[PDB]
Ligand binder design. Structure first.
Ligand SMILES: *[C@@H]1O[C@H](CO)[C@@H](O[C@@H]2O[C@H](CO)[C@@H](O[C@@H]3O[C@H](CO[C@H]4O[C@H](CO)[C@@H](O)[C@H](O[C@H]5O[C@H](CO)[C@@H](O)[C@H](O)[C@@H]5O)[C@@H]4O)[C@@H](O)[C@H](O[C@H]4O[C@H](CO)[C@@H](O)[C@H](O)[C@@H]4O)[C@@H]3O)[C@H](O)[C@H]2NC(C)=O)[C@H](O)[C@H]1NC(C)=O
Ligand SMILES: *[C@@H]1O[C@H](CO)[C@@H](O)[C@H](O)[C@H]1NC(C)=O
Ligand SMILES: *[C@@H]1O[C@H](CO)[C@@H](O)[C@H](O)[C@H]1NC(C)=O
Lengths: 226, 105, 211, 128
C-alpha cells in the first residue's frame, strides 16, 4: 500500500549543499513520521533525523549543525539538505516511515513514559558520492557469444556508482546476471552484464542491452550478434 | 573556462602541485595539456607538453600528470627562480591552445 | 561502528544478545540489514513483529527487570546472513540516536558450490578504439572466495588485472569479476589467453584466443 | 638555437591598425609554424593564431576570425639548415581594450601532435 522512492544527485562536490528527495506512494505524508538514514562503507547505520506529522523536526546531534529536513504536502515529497559535505558524507541514504511508540512503565500522570520511534517501511536507497572528480558516462561494448550459450554487455569507465542494466528494454529477464563494478586505478568503475539464453535463439531473437548512468544522463543501447 | 589553482606556496626543497581542469569543451581525455612557465611581462618558457613530456633542458623535478578530469603540474625541489606565474593550455594537433586562468607560485 | 561476529550452524537456533543492556523498562527494536540493501525491521516493540516476517524471528519481552534483550532466529538458513542491529530504548537513558553495534551472522554448514567461469574475448568495437579487455566472470560459487590467475599463452600475466571481491547473489551464492587490460597488439601477438579460477581445493581454467 | 626579434613598442589610439614584425634567425624559418600570442592585463593570455611559413596555411581563434591578417615573406638561405624570416600581424576594428604585450613564438616540432606549439618566444612589444 505504501512505498517510498529516493532520488539524489549521486555526485556532490566537497563543501556543497547535498540535497535529496523522497516520494511516498499510496499513503499521505502529513500524517506519519519520516526518517533519513545513511549507511557509509565500514560504518554502521546512522540515524540522521526525523520529521513529525505536524512537520516538527529533530536532528541527530552527530550532524545537527548542518542538516535541514523539509516536507512538501502538496504531493507526498519530503526533502533533505546537508551542506558542508566531506568525503565521509558519501553513503546510501535511505528513506523510511517512522512509527511513534509510547512505552509506559509507571504513571502517565507523572510522565513516567517515553517515546520511541521505529522505521517499518523503507525506501531502496540513493547512492551519493562526494568527490572533487567529475562525472563521466560509460562506454558500452557488446560481448557476442559462440546446451546453451551466453552473451554479454561490457560497461566500462564510468563514474560514479551506480548504473542500471536491463535486457530488451525490460522484456528479457530470465537468466540475467549483472556483476558488481570494479574500481580501476584510473578511478572509474567498470561493469559487466551477461544473460544465458538457449543456443538456438541466436537466429534471430534480437538481444538489446540497455545501460543508464543517471549522474551523466547518458543512456545507451547496444545489440549483440556473432 | 580552463580553471587553474587560485594560488599556493611551499619552501626550498619541498614540492608544489598546480591544477588545471575544465568542462568537456577543453578537457581532458581527448585533449593534450601543455604547461608554460610565464614570468609576468617577459618571454615565456615551455616546461611540459603532451600532458607529461618535458621540453629540452627542463629540470626533471618538473613533472606533469593528467587524470580523466584534471591535469596536474608538480614542481618538486623548489628553488629561488620558481617565483613565477604558471599557465596551463589545452590543445589538439590541428587547433589552438586555449590557455588557463593562472597560478601564482 | 564496530562489528561483532557470530556463527550459527545451518538449521540451528541463533541467539543474538543485544549490545547494550537496559537500565530501566525497555522498548527494543531489531533490524536486519545486509549491506547494499534497505534494512528490514524485524521486531519493533520488545516482542511485536510486523507482517511479512516469519514466526521464527522472536524477541524477549519486558516482563520483569533484568531480562536481557535477545533476538532468537530458530531454524537458521543461508538467507539469515546479514547485520543485526539492536535499537535500544529505555526509561533511564536518553534518546536512542545510535542503532548500536552490528552482529554479523554467518550460517555454517552450507553446501559447497563450484564456480561457473565465463571468459569473453576483446570486442571488435573496443579493438577499433585501440583498447582491449579480457573479462573473466565467476558466479554461483560457495564459499565466497576464489583466486584468479591470468596467463598469456603459458607464461603468467599479473600487470593489468582487476578482480572483484566476492559478492553474495540472490540465490545465496557468490560472484566475482576479473578484468585483464592489455593493448590490442598484445592481444594479436599472443597465441591464447587463459583465466584460471581456483576455488576451495580445485582450479578451473577457461581460455580464449583471437580466431 | 633560434632568435625572434620583435618590432618597436610604439603606441597608437583606437580605430587604427598596427603591424607587428618578428625576425627569425638560427633556424630554418620554413620548418616551424609562427604563433601570435597576446598577454592582456584585463584578461588571461590569449592565443591569437599561427601560420605556416612553408605552406602559407593560417589558423586563428574565432575571437580574431575577421579582424587579423597574418602574413610571412619567404625565407633567405643562410646555410644548409639556417635561414632568416619575418612574420607580420595586423588588427582591423581596433580599440584600446586590446592593450597589452604581444609575443611571437615558433612551433615546437615539425611533426607529431605538438607541431605548432609555441616553443621559442620573442622579447615582446608594449602597445597602446
Ligand atoms: C617540408 O617541411 C615542412 C615544414 O616542416 C613540412 O610541413 C609540415 O608537415 C607536417 C607533417 O606533414 C605538418 O604536421 C601536421 O600538422 C597538421 C596540422 O595542419 C592541419 O591543420 C590545418 C589548420 O587546422 C589544416 O588546414 C590542414 O588541413 C588541410 O589544409 C592544408 C592547407 O594548406 C593542407 O596543406 C593540409 O595538408 C591539409 O590537407 C592540416 O590538416 C596536423 O594535423 C598533423 O597531425 C596529424 O598527423 C600526425 C602525424 O603526421 C599525428 O601524430 C597527429 O596525431 C595527427 O594525426 C601534423 O602534426 C606540419 O603542419 C607542416 N607544416 C609546418 C611544420 O609548418 C613538410 O611536410 C615537409 N615536406 C617534405 C617533403 O619534407
Ligand atoms: C593581408 O595583407 C595583404 C597585403 O597585401 C593582402 O594582400 C591580403 O589580402 C590581406 N589578407 C586579407 C585576409 O585581407
Ligand atoms: C630540432 O633540431 C634542431 C637542430 O639543431 C634543434 O636546434 C631544435 O632545437 C630541435 N627542435 C626541438 C623542439 O628540440
Amino acid at each position: 500500500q505504501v512505498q517510498l522512492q529516493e532520488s539524489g544527485p549521486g555526485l556532490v562536490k566537497p563543501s556543497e549543499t547535498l540535497s535529496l528527495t523522497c516520494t511516498v506512494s499510496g499513503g499521505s505524508i502529513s500524517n506519519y513520521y519520516w526518517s533519513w538514514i545513511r549507511q557509509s562503507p565500514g560504518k554502521g547505520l546512522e540515524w540522521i533525523g526525523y520529521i513529525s506529522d505536524s512537520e516538527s523536526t529533530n536532528y541527530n546531534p552527530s550532524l545537527k549543525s548542518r542538516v535541514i529536513i523539509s516536507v512538501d504536502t502538496s504531493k507526498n515529497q519530503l526533502s533533505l539538505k546537508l551542506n558542508s559535505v566531506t568525503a565521509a558524507d558519501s553513503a546510501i541514504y535511505y528513506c523510511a516511515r517512522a512509527q511513534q511508540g509510547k512505552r509506559i512503565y509507571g504513571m502517565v500522570s507523572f510522565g513516567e513514559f517515553f517515546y520511541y520511534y521505529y522505521m517499518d517501511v523503507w525506501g531502496k536507497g540513493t547512492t551519493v558520492t562526494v568527490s572533487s572528480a567529475s562525472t563521466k558516462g560509460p562506454s558500452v561494448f557488446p560481448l557476442a557469444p559462440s546446451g546453451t550459450a551466453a552473451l554479454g554487455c561490457l560497461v566500462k569507465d564510468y563514474f560514479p556508482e551506480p548504473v542500471t542494466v536491463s535486457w530488451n528494454s525490460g522484456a528479457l529477464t530470465s537468466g540475467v546476471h549483472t556483476f558488481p563494478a570494479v574500481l580501476q586505478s584510473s578511478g572509474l568503475y567498470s561493469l559487466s552484464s551477461v544473460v544465458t539464453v538457449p543456443s538456438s535463439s541466436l537466429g534471430t531473437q534480437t538481444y538489446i542491452c540497455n545501460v543508464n548512468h543517471k549522474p551523466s544522463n547518458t543512456k545507451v543501447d547496444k545489440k549483440v550478434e556473432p | 573556462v580552463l580553471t587553474q589553482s587560485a594560488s599556493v606556496s611551499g619552501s626550498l626543497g619541498q614540492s608544489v602541485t598546480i591544477s588545471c581542469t575544465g568542462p568537456n569543451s577543453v578537457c581532458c581525455s581527448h585533449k593534450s595539456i601543455s604547461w608554460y612557465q610565464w614570468p609576468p611581462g617577459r618571454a615565456p618558457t615551455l616546461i611540459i607538453y603532451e600532458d607529461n613530456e618535458r621540453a629540452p633542458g627542463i629540470s626533471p623535478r618538473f613533472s606533469g600528470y593528467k587524470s580523466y578530469w584534471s591535469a596536474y603540474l608538480t614542481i618538486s625541489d623548489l628553488r629561488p627562480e620558481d617565483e613565477t606565474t604558471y599557465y596551463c593550455c589545452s590543445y589538439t594537433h590541428n587547433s589552438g591552445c586555449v590557455f588557463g586562468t593562472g597560478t601564482k607560485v | 561502528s564496530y562489528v561483532r561476529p557470530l556463527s550459527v550452524a545451518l538449521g540451528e537456533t541463533a541467539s543474538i544478545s543485544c549490545g547494550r543492556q537496559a537500565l530501566g523498562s525497555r522498548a527494543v527494536q531489531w533490524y536486519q540489514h545486509r549491506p547494499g540493501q534497505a534494512p528490514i525491521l524485524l521486531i519493533y516493540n520488545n516482542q511485536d513483529r510486523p507482517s511479512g516476517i516469519p514466526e521464527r524471528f522472536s524477541g524477549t519481552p519486558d516482563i520483569n527487570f533484568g531480562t536481557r534483550a535477545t533476538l532468537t532466529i530458530s531454524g537458521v538458513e543461508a538467507g539469515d546472513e546479514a547485520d543485526y542491529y539492536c535499537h535500544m530504548w529505555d526509561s533511564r537513558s536518553g534518546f536512542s540516536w545510535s542503532f548500536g553495534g552490528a552482529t554479523r551472522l554467518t550460517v555454517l554448514g552450507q553446501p559447497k558450490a563450484a564456480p561457473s567461469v565465463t571468459l569473453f574475448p576483446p570486442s571488435s568495437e573496443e579493438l577499433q578504439a585501440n583498447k582491449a579487455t579480457l573479462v573473466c566472470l565467476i558466479s554461483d560459487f560457495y564459499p565466497g572466495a576464489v583466486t584468479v590467475a591470468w596467463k598469456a599463452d603459458s607464461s603468467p600475466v599479473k600487470a593489468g588485472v582487476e578482480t572483484t571481491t566476492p559478492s553474495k547473489q540472490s540465490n545465496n551464492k557468490y560472484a566475482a569479476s576479473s578484468y585483464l587490460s592489455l593493448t590490442p597488439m598484445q592481444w594479436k601477438m599472443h597465441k591464447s589467453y587463459s583465466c584460471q579460477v581456483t576455488h576451495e581445493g580445485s582450479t578451473v581454467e577457461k581460455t580464449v584466443a583471437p580466431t | 638555437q633560434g632568435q625572434l626579434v620583435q618590432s618597436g613598442a610604439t603606441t597608437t589610439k583606437p580605430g587604427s591598425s598596427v603591424k607587428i614584425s618578428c625576425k627569425t634567425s638560427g633556424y630554418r624559418f620554413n620548418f616551424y609554424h609562427i604563433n601570435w600570442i597576446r598577454q592582456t592585463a584585463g584578461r588571461g593570455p590569449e592565443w591569437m593564431g599561427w601560420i605556416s611559413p612553408y605552406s602559407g596555411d593560417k589558423n586563428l581563434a574565432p575571437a580574431f576570425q575577421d579582424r587579423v591578417n597574418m602574413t610571412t615573406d619567404t625565407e633567405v638561405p643562410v646555410t644548409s639548415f639556417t635561414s632568416t624570416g619575418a612574420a607580420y600581424m595586423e588588427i582591423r576594428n581596433l580599440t584600446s581594450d586590446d592593450t597589452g604585450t604581444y609575443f611571437c613564438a615558433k612551433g615546437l616540432l615539425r611533426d607529431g601532435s605538438s607541431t605548432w606549439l609555441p616553443y621559442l618566444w620573442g622579447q615582446g612589444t608594449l602597445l597602446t
